[PDB]
Amino acid sequence: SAASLWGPYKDIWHKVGLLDKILKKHKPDFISLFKNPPKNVQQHEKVQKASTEGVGTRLLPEQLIKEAFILSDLFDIGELAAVELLLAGEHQQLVAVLLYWDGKRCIANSLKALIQSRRPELASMTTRFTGLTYKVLTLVSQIDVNNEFEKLQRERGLGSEKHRKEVSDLIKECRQSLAESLFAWACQSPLGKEDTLLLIGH
Structure with missing residues (x-):
């Protein structure tokens, strides 16, 4: 499962820029994607009860439930996550x-830092499962999905531009950081002809 908090990620990055092997060790998070949980119906009843449990449990008031549903509908994401x-x-x-x-x-950013900066146990650790390399292409996809546009179309008659500029911004940054990761991979060469052909196609 992936910790779905910003904080461990923020602190770890701050260590670099200290690197504690322990935190870094629970590495699979650097999947870069949220493929497994998308919005789920099964999760909606769970949330509706006002009792919610993570992979302790807590009581859920109505106000919170609304913010939570706004998220899942807004970004096709699992309700508990x-x-x-x-x-x-x-x-x-x-x-x-x-x-x-x-x-x-x-x-x-962390992946980018590691792949680009270090020359190494950790870089080997990150890449080794690869796996990051499998994922990189999918990560550029996904950012691609135009759910936002669909929302925009539905919105017409009503209009929430600001919320959108905010998301479009985070994504562009993600694409940009994604660029650095790919480049870094090339410098730290992965093996053969297949990747190039795949990328050219993508």
């Missing part, structure tokens, strides 16, 4: 949206 996100970040509104993006931003 969405809650972990609200919990981690100070509850103010929505904050949950922030943690969602900050968590991703940090992960990407």
Whole structure:
């Protein structure tokens, strides 16, 4: 499972820039994606009960439930994960949206830092499962999905530009950081002809 908090990611990055092997060790988070949990129906009943449990459990008031549903509908995301996100970040509104993006931003930056900066046990650790390399292409996809546009179309007659500029911004940054990771991989060459062909196609 992946910790769905921004904080461990933020602190770890701060260590670099100290690197503690322990925190870094629970590495799989640097998947860069949220492929496994998308919005789930099964999770909605769980949340609706007002009792929610993560992979302790906590009571859920109505106000929180609304923020949580806003997240899942807004970004096709699992309802419980969405809650972990609200919990981690100070509850103010929505904050949950922030943690969602900050968590991703940090992960990407760290991967970028490692792949580019170090020349190494850790880089070997990160790449070794690869796996990051499998994921890099998918990560550029996904940012691609134009759910935002669909929302925009539905919105017409009503209009929430600002919330969108905010998301479009986080994504562009993600693409940009994604660029650095790919480049870094090339400098730290992965093996053969297949990747190039795949990328050329993508």
